[PDB]
Amino acid sequence: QSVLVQMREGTPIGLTGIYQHPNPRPALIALYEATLKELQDKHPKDSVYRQSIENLTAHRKQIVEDNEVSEVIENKIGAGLIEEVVIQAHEELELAKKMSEWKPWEELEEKPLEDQWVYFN
């Protein structure tokens, strides 16, 4: 399937370039479930990154599942308007897709030198 994350033409909104997004919450909860599924499948359960984004998107998805109207969920979420929120959930989905390729839970590959990181005491 395919999902819409940002209207680039439609009913105007306070931000320029964003417009009003029809049916924000099904797109929102589907984008959440994609983040949950890919993040559970491809990251190790020890890692702190996986733990907090699983908890974070579980918290946001709980808020979106509970309340029925738009203006109250966007107060409980804490981010901007829900068009902007759908852009953010999209963005963290793409981030969680990139992190499985980059694999950052490994120990660091390039250790610094001792002469590196000195600043005049």
Residues of the shown chain interacting with other proteins in the complex, contacts defined by CB under 8 A: 1-9, 11-18, 46-49, 51-53, 55-56, 59-60, 63, 71, 74-81, 87-92, 94-95, 98, 102-113, 115-121
Tell me how far, at minimum, the Cβ of 70 lies from other proteins, in Å: 9
Residues 84-90: contacts with CB within 8 Å, 24+ apart?
84/15, 84/18, 85/24, 85/28, 86/5, 86/6, 86/21, 86/24, 86/27, 86/28, 86/31, 87/5, 87/6, 87/18, 89/5, 89/28, 89/31, 89/32, 89/35, 89/57, 89/60, 90/5, 90/6, 90/31
**Which CB, 63 or 68, lies closer to other proteins?**
63
Tokens 């759908």 found at? 86
State the minimum distance, in angstroms, from the CB of residue 4 to other proteins.
Answer: 6
Nearer Cβ to other proteins, position 14 or 68? 14
Shortest distance in whole angstroms from residue 29 CB to other proteins: 15
CB of 43 vs other proteins, minimal distance in Å: 11
Nearer to other proteins, 35 or 68 (CB): 35
What is the CA 12 to chain-centroid distance, rounded?
Answer: 24
Residue number with CB closer to other proteins (9 or 68): 9
